[PDB]
Design an enzyme around this catalytic site. Sequence first.
Site, PDB file in Angstrom:
ATOM      1  NE  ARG A 227       6.517   7.311  -8.908  1.00  9.30           N
ATOM      2  CZ  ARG A 227       5.888   6.915  -7.823  1.00  9.30           C
ATOM      3  NH1 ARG A 227       5.668   7.818  -6.928  1.00  9.30           N
ATOM      4  NH2 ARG A 227       5.248   5.842  -7.834  1.00  9.30           N
ATOM      5  CG  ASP A 229       6.787   5.504  -3.696  1.00 14.78           C
ATOM      6  OD1 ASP A 229       5.712   6.082  -3.839  1.00 14.78           O
ATOM      7  OD2 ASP A 229       7.056   4.902  -2.630  1.00 14.78           O
ATOM      8  CD  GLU A 257       2.587  10.097  -4.936  1.00 16.51           C
ATOM      9  OE1 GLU A 257       1.405  10.455  -4.805  1.00 16.51           O
ATOM     10  OE2 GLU A 257       2.992   8.974  -5.526  1.00 16.51           O
ATOM     11  CG  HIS A 327      -0.591   5.832  -8.069  1.00 16.16           C
ATOM     12  ND1 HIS A 327       0.461   5.797  -7.134  1.00 16.16           N
ATOM     13  CD2 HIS A 327       0.102   6.950  -8.671  1.00 16.16           C
ATOM     14  CE1 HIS A 327       1.313   6.467  -7.028  1.00 16.16           C
ATOM     15  NE2 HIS A 327       1.241   7.456  -8.105  1.00 16.16           N
ATOM     16  CG  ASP A 328      -0.909   7.756  -4.072  1.00 13.25           C
ATOM     17  OD1 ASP A 328      -1.453   6.983  -3.333  1.00 13.25           O
ATOM     18  OD2 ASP A 328       0.471   8.154  -4.254  1.00 13.25           O
TER      19      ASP A 328
HETATM   20  C1  LIG Z   1      -0.824   5.133   0.032  1.00 11.27           C
HETATM   21  C2  LIG Z   1       0.485   5.951  -0.040  1.00 11.27           C
HETATM   22  O1  LIG Z   1       0.651   6.629   1.077  1.00 11.27           O
HETATM   23  C3  LIG Z   1       2.088   7.150   1.446  1.00 11.27           C
HETATM   24  O2  LIG Z   1       2.360   8.446   0.724  1.00 11.27           O
HETATM   25  C4  LIG Z   1       1.046   9.397   0.622  1.00 11.27           C
HETATM   26  C5  LIG Z   1       0.144   9.166  -0.222  1.00 11.27           C
HETATM   27  O3  LIG Z   1       0.873   9.099  -1.592  1.00 11.27           O
HETATM   28  C6  LIG Z   1      -0.809  10.373  -0.470  1.00 11.27           C
HETATM   29  O4  LIG Z   1      -1.641  10.183  -1.724  1.00 11.27           O
HETATM   30  C7  LIG Z   1      -1.625  10.194   0.780  1.00 11.27           C
HETATM   31  O5  LIG Z   1      -2.242   8.975   0.770  1.00 11.27           O
HETATM   32  C8  LIG Z   1      -3.779   8.991   0.507  1.00 11.27           C
HETATM   33  C9  LIG Z   1      -4.518  10.476   1.073  1.00 11.27           C
HETATM   34  O6  LIG Z   1      -4.418  10.632   2.570  1.00 11.27           O
HETATM   35  C10 LIG Z   1      -6.004  10.286   0.857  1.00 11.27           C
HETATM   36  O7  LIG Z   1      -6.745  11.436   1.701  1.00 11.27           O
HETATM   37  C11 LIG Z   1      -6.098  10.434  -0.659  1.00 11.27           C
HETATM   38  O8  LIG Z   1      -7.541  10.583  -1.200  1.00 11.27           O
HETATM   39  O9  LIG Z   1      -5.449   9.566  -1.161  1.00 11.27           O
HETATM   40  C12 LIG Z   1      -3.956   9.344  -0.875  1.00 11.27           C
HETATM   41  C13 LIG Z   1      -3.494   7.675  -1.670  1.00 11.27           C
HETATM   42  O10 LIG Z   1      -4.059   6.825  -0.771  1.00 11.27           O
HETATM   43  O11 LIG Z   1      -0.721  10.237   1.972  1.00 11.27           O
HETATM   44  C14 LIG Z   1       0.317   9.511   2.105  1.00 11.27           C
HETATM   45  C15 LIG Z   1       1.465  10.208   3.338  1.00 11.27           C
HETATM   46  O12 LIG Z   1       0.659  10.192   4.284  1.00 11.27           O
HETATM   47  C16 LIG Z   1       3.135   6.217   0.886  1.00 11.27           C
HETATM   48  O13 LIG Z   1       4.519   6.917   1.098  1.00 11.27           O
HETATM   49  C17 LIG Z   1       2.900   5.797  -0.733  1.00 11.27           C
HETATM   50  O14 LIG Z   1       4.042   4.832  -1.140  1.00 11.27           O
HETATM   51  C18 LIG Z   1       1.479   5.056  -0.282  1.00 11.27           C
HETATM   52  N1  LIG Z   1       1.136   4.402  -1.857  1.00 11.27           N
HETATM   53  C19 LIG Z   1       2.129   3.166  -1.853  1.00 11.27           C
HETATM   54  C20 LIG Z   1       2.811   2.557  -0.642  1.00 11.27           C
HETATM   55  C21 LIG Z   1       2.077   1.191  -0.475  1.00 11.27           C
HETATM   56  C22 LIG Z   1       2.582   0.652   1.033  1.00 11.27           C
HETATM   57  O15 LIG Z   1       1.516  -0.173   1.701  1.00 11.27           O
HETATM   58  C23 LIG Z   1       1.204   0.500  -1.379  1.00 11.27           C
HETATM   59  O16 LIG Z   1       0.440  -0.446  -0.495  1.00 11.27           O
HETATM   60  C24 LIG Z   1       0.527   1.417  -2.453  1.00 11.27           C
HETATM   61  O17 LIG Z   1      -0.210   0.519  -3.180  1.00 11.27           O
HETATM   62  C25 LIG Z   1       1.472   2.222  -2.851  1.00 11.27           C
HETATM   63  O18 LIG Z   1       0.796   2.971  -3.755  1.00 11.27           O
END
Ligand SMILES: C[C@H]1O[C@H](O[C@H]2[C@H](O)[C@@H](O)[C@@H](O[C@H]3[C@H](O)[C@@H](O)[C@H](O)O[C@@H]3CO)O[C@@H]2CO)[C@H](O)[C@@H](O)[C@@H]1N[C@H]1C=C(CO)[C@@H](O)[C@H](O)[C@H]1O
Length: 686
Positions: A227, A229, A257, A327-328
């Site tokens: 998977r 990221d 993703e 997780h997201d």
């Molecule tokens: C937090 C996450 O953000 C980036 O990619 C995406 C998210 O995967 C996507 O879900 C979305 O973020 C949130 C969304 O805005 C919100 O409205 C919804 O309710 O939930 C979503 C998840 O929180 O948008 C962003 C892009 O704008 C990164 O590319 C991901 O890798 C990131 N998750 C990773 C990254 C980090 C870096 O700090 C870790 O802290 C986190 O735990 C890990 O899962």
Amino acid sequence: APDTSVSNKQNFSTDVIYQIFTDRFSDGNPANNPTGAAFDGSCTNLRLYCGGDWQGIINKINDGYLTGMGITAIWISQPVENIYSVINYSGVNNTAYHGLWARDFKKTNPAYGTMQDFKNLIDTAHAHNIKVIIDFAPNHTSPASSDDPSFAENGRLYDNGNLLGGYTNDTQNLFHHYGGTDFSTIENGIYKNLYDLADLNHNNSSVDVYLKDAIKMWLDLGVDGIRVDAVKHMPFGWQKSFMATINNYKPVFTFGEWFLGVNEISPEYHQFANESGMSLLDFRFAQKARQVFRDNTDNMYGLKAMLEGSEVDYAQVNDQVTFIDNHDMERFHTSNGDRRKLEQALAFTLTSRGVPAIYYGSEQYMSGGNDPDNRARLPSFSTTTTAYQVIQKLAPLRKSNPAIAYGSTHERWINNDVIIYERKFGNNVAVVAINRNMNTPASITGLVTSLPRGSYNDVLGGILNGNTLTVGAGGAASNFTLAPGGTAVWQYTTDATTPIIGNVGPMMAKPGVTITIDGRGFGSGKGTVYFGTTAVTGADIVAWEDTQIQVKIPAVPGGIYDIRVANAAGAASNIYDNFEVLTGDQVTVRFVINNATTALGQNVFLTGNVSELGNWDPNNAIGPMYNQVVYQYPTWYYDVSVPAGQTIEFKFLKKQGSTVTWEGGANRTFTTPTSGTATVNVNWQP
Ligand SMILES: C[C@H]1O[C@H](O[C@H]2[C@H](O)[C@@H](O)[C@@H](O[C@H]3[C@H](O)[C@@H](O)[C@H](O)O[C@@H]3CO)O[C@@H]2CO)[C@H](O)[C@@H](O)[C@@H]1N[C@H]1C=C(CO)[C@@H](O)[C@H](O)[C@H]1O
Ligand SMILES: [Ca+2]
Ligand SMILES: [Ca+2]
């Protein structure tokens, strides 16, 4: 071997995936637990290590908890060594419990277990016929500040122990230094930093080569899937070369993703799933399912639509990973809501098309908001919850009933609050009825299905309030009332007399590579595989069996082909389109063109004589090129995946509406490197 075999790493449609956060699952070993302000044995502060490890899952596989649930594939956290820093993001300490802050892609994260602990895991999983998928985040390392090299580990990167360099004093240019992204554009979000994560530069041969050797090592250890990221934040052209490298070595089910929101549907999202060489997490499914079964912001006709729109938009819909939460996003189960919504949503995901994925703890009705809330520790392991039962009764159907795994979807009866759909693969059938309403019953009149005469018992056994179905003559069933919140699953399985293809993996590779065709009806003795019009037989078919054929890709010119099978008796299968045979091994080449003046609505594209460059057809030209971050207008640039060690020909062009403008002069030639990267710098010729 059969299509359901654990050795089948190419395809996962017949599997049920259990997504685990190693740290928050089971601490099978305390000796390996982090110490100090990095550990929180009470999992009270959710941004700290709680102690979970690999030995903790081996325990849950051994005492039958996971297996007894029906699971046939666990998807774990990044096994790669992380930074050891306890980052205090404004008052709150934070750690790498999530595995996404790589430090050395060639070594394991001590807290999760050792290299030996990893083999044990792969072996305990396989011996119990469970497949292992890992996370891989090649888009960055860890939090870094170049201004203050004292922050975190300064985004450093080691190669099996050797330091390659850090975010401060980057003379070798291993990272990007353009500030952070504001997500304004796709270009912007790719080359700029994601928040504060030291962004990797894949145009740098050292980086490119290191990440590729790293994934192979992990392939050599026994993983069966990947998977990736942040697929949206890396260059498409590099990802394709990263995929071509996996597939040309030891292909495994890879997915990525790309987050979509509510009623948000982008074409780049689909283009990625259709042309990258990897599938995505079906966010179009997830958000629609939650709107109908959870938030109730849409009715069943929207569900019907989504299921239908997907059966066309995606080229290989059977390869998209479906889910209800993860997780997201917020946990599907709420406080002011009943477990029934969850219980149904799970049944819908389990019987629907794709690779179903259950986020750990869903079977223990875990509630919780956004990160880190949705990442708490599994409170219990009671194998008697209804949700455990539902997954338990439905999950093995994917491996026994080919219609659940490969079948098409057909809505046979629909209403505002109820849907009855059919999944069929040849003679195999599965009808699933769901009444989402909890107050009023649903009288079903005149339901026709493909089930032959009989009275089918609910596979769910009535725990979801499901009845038995009396199917008379003509697949027609006697009327019945579907109780509120009722859910039933009825099925039928029999041999296949006609060869039929359910899936193919990988979807792109160079000649000489062994692909895997899965289905029913192939027959015992060797038959015939057609890549286009080119038929393959003899020693070139590595394996033939009724459910799975393994055959080498013949030497054909690169491009898109239609797959087809024919058993020894000339009975030919259905067509499985969109197979990309590459010209050969790939390398990523950045093309930079200077002085391409364009109008409002005019963009620069590229094309060349190999299939990866569109084969001179301006409708398949690479682009629109980029023009703001790495280079600015009038200079355009793009990272493209091309064949390694070949002299390709190419010309840039401008495209505006139906009007195409080619560069003047002669065709440009270029000899590509065998490995690493290359950058082409040129000037627009009128
Ligand atoms: C937090 C996450 O953000 C980036 O990619 C995406 C998210 O995967 C996507 O879900 C979305 O973020 C949130 C969304 O805005 C919100 O409205 C919804 O309710 O939930 C979503 C998840 O929180 O948008 C962003 C892009 O704008 C990164 O590319 C991901 O890798 C990131 N998750 C990773 C990254 C980090 C870096 O700090 C870790 O802290 C986190 O735990 C890990 O899962
Ligand atoms: Ca531990
Ligand atoms: Ca990036």
